[PDB]
């Protein structure tokens, strides 16, 4: 079943409510470090600044324990609204932070998960300090609330809301840097670019070169359209699919499903205004939409079970928030974000749609009740030899059949006899 539940955080210490916090998943562990804590336990005397503390995430049987590592080779400076991406399974690097609003960092720091050590890459960031204007070595201009997308061998940032020196403006350009030597190179494709936006979340779609960026915030207006850019041919292709209501400061976490990859966007602020003027009003949405890449359409998701409440129950939208999805438990967890008052609440909802892959088609798809024949079921992620099972009938009855993997993409079964010729389905069971 799919529903929104709250997991109580327990441990020696508990992370304070934060807005500019980035949570990503690398290998089998989750590492999240965020600043802008409401409590003034850092810096003090006004001008509240971010806390450079990284806490690992472990969740078992709806129980979460938070552990923070205070030992590192060197400590990176505080980051606010910083995009975070992970290279391979041992190289997570976070770039794009802001110190006391006016200062924006264009420097990049890499943290190795195994040794818990932060390091500067080559001569790209020889000196690290908070400077209002930085325009040397790194091609990207210092910016905050940008989007970082990771592809094999490359890192791409298309986020705006950053400006060289005092001037601040939305960014209409995307910068890609190879992580092999940490070289930073600006990439300008031929296709017409989308309007510059800030506080937008972009992720790779279905393990393909095309990456979709949806919902951005800009000074002129708020844009809520989907743009997908593929490294091959360079020019991005516009699907033209757009969200019903304009959405900004929205976080999206990619989910892997064998039939179609699913993208979920929860939180953020939607405000519809005409050109200039107004724009003061801000509405937070707790409902999270679901998008299928093959379909390329946004479909609203509702809770099947109210758990006897008799009404839908959901957590506060919290505007911008950090959401990480665990493939093993097939659940998406969001730590929340500032929504007027910072709230330290963690809510994780299991995705019923993201059914485990362990069918494409079957042949034959018709058969006689009297006769006995064995059919072929083809699809993805099928188990090999033992521990493989399938369903039979389903037309007001429950059945299981003997089966055997022909290959990891094909299963043979014999059709059971059926009393009545009505409607028959065929499904898969992984026992658990």
């Amino acid at each position: 079943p799919l529903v929104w539940t709250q997991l109580k955080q327990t441990g020696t210490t508990q992370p304070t409510a934060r807005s500019g916090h980035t949570i990503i998943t690398v290998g089998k562990t989750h590492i999240m470090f965020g600043g802008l804590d409401n409590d003034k336990n850092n810096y003090k005397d006004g001008k509240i600044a971010p806390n450079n503390q990284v806490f690992t995430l472990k969740l078992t049987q709806n129980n979460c324990e938070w552990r923070q590592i205070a030992c590192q080779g060197d400590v990176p400076l505080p980051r606010c609204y910083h995009a975070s991406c992970a290279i391979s399974a041992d190289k997570m690097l976070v770039f794009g932070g802001s110190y006391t609003s006016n200062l924006r960092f264009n420097d990049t720091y890499i943290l190795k998960t195994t040794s818990y050590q932060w390091s500067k890459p080559a001569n790209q960031i020889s000196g690290g300090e908070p400077k209002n204007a930085e325009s040397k070595i790194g091609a990207p201009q210092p910016r905050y609330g940008h989007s970082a997308t990771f592809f094999e061998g490359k890192v791409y940032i298309f986020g705006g809301h950053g400006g060289i020196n005092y001037q601040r403006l939305a960014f209409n350009d995307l910068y890609v840097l190879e992580t092999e030597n940490f070289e930073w190179t600006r990439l300008e494709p031929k296709g017409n670019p989308p309007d510059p936006r800030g506080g937008h979340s972009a992720a790779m779609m279905a393990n393909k070169p095309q990456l979709m960026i949806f919902g951005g915030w800009s000074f002129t207006s708020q844009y809520s359209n989907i743009m997908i850019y593929d490294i091959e041919k360079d020019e991005w292709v516009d699907p033209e699919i757009a969200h019903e209501i304009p959405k900004w400061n929205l976080s999206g976490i990619m989910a892997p499903s064998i039939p179609s990859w699913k993208y979920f966007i929860f939180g953020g602020s939607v405000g519809s205004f005409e050109e200039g003027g107004n724009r003061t009003n801000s509405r937070f949405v707790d409902d999270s939409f679901v998008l299928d890449i093959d379909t390329l359409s946004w479909s609203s998701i509702n809770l099947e079970a109210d758990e006897t409440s008799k009404a839908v129950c959901k957590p506060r939208p919290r505007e911008s928030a950090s959401i990480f999805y665990d493939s093993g438990e097939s659940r998406a967890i969001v730590f929340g974000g500032w929504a007027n008052n910072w709230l330290n609440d963690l809510w994780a909802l299991n995705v019923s749609t993201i059914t485990g892959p362990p069918i494409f088609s079957i042949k034959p798809a018709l058969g006689p009740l009297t006769g006995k024949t064995k059919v072929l079921i083809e699809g993805d992620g099928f188990k090999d030899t033992q521990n493989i099972s399938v369903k039979f009938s389903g037309g007001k009855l429950e059945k299981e059949v003997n089966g055997t993997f022909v290959n990891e993409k094909e299963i043979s079964c014999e059709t059971p006899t059926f009393d009545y010729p009505r409607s028959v389905e065929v499904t898969v069971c992984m026992n658990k």
Binding site: A17, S19, G20, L36, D37, N38, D39, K40, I48, S101, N102, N132, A133, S135, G163, I164, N165, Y166, Q167, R168, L169, A170, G199, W217, S218, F219, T220, S221, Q222, W248, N249, S269, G271, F273, E275, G276, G277, N278, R279, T280, N281, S282, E319, S320, W338, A339, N340, N341, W342, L343
Partner: protein, 304 residues
């Protein structure tokens, strides 16, 4: 030495040219031959130009700060004795429109003041120094907006929070109407978030939005013609603490309020639920009927 730290970096050339201009003048000094009248004309004109420009930059920043302080005011004004929930929105709406217009008027003057600095500074917008300074003016306006919105929220908290109200003689402010409901006792306000029709939380929620709404009037500082200010104000830790405190106070009255409403609900709510045809069940004889009737008369007096 009186020039602002942000000002010198933004336009180093104007200050540096004066220093280069006066550098020869100090070397020139010798009471043996004085050409100070011409020296004075060139030096006073460059110094006055340098001085007047510095004053205009200082005057602009000072004007921006003064406008923000006056605009916050009081977010909510209490008109003596209690009226009604809808009535407070009605009386408050007229006050909110005037306050919103005044904030926009102050914002227009601050925006115009920013244009004057560029004319006085005579520095291209493309140059980074002006861009860094431009963001700084916007940050001060953001900081001022956060303080102004925080004060209005704080004023509501003193009225909204019960402990401050109990100590004071102000006592009641809002008005609640109670009408008996077959399903349960029901208040005109209905004491709950509800998310439908009209409720005190829904109204208070609307009131909180008005402070957030002041974001539109500022319309950013520079670079983006259309910009929002709610995302920045919401991010401030201080604004979140004030908003969080208001929610806690609302929850406290609802709890104790439910207990007060529960006492009536223990007997009155149970009675409305029961059907009249329940009288036969109470009976099971003529003597029993007489005793039940006497008890019923006693119950009528007790209920009155």
């Amino acid at each position: 030495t009186c020039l602002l730290p942000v000002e010198e970096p933004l336009v180093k050339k104007k200050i540096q040219d004066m220093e280069e201009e006066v550098k020869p003048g100090i070397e020139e000094i010798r009471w043996k031959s004085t050409n100070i009248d011409q020296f004075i004309s060139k030096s006073k004109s460059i110094v006055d130009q340098l001085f007047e420009t510095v004053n205009k930059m200082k005057d602009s920043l000072q004007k921006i700060h003064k406008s923000l302080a006056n605009f916050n005011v009081k977010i909510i004004e209490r008109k003596n004795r209690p009226m009604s929930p809808d009535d407070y929105d009605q009386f408050l709406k007229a006050i909110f429109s005037n306050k919103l217009t005044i904030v926009k008027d102050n914002g227009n003057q601050i925006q115009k003041l920013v244009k004057e600095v560029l004319d006085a500074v005579k520095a291209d917008k493309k140059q980074n120094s002006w861009k860094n300074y431009n963001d700084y003016v916007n940050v001060i306006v953001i900081e001022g907006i956060s303080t102004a919105i925080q004060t209005a929220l704080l004023h509501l908290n003193e009225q909204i929070n019960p402990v401050f109200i109990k100590r004071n003689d102000i006592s009641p402010l809002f008005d609640i109407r109670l009408e008996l409901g077959q399903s349960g006792i029901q208040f005109d306000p209905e004491i709950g978030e509800s998310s439908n029709q009209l409720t005190v939380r829904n109204t208070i929620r609307n009131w909180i939005n008005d402070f957030f709404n002041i974001a539109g009037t500022i319309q950013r500082l520079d670079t983006t013609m259309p910009g929002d200010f709610l995302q920045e104000i919401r991010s401030f830790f201080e604004i979140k603490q004030c908003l969080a405190m208001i929610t806690q106070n609302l929850e406290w009255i609802e709890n104790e309020c439910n207990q007060f409403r529960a006492r009536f609900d223990t007997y009155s709510y149970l009675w409305t639920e029961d059907e009249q045809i329940s009288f036969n069940r109470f009976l099971d004889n003529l003597d029993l009927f007489d005793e039940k009737i006497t008890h019923l008369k006693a119950i009528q007096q007790e209920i009155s």
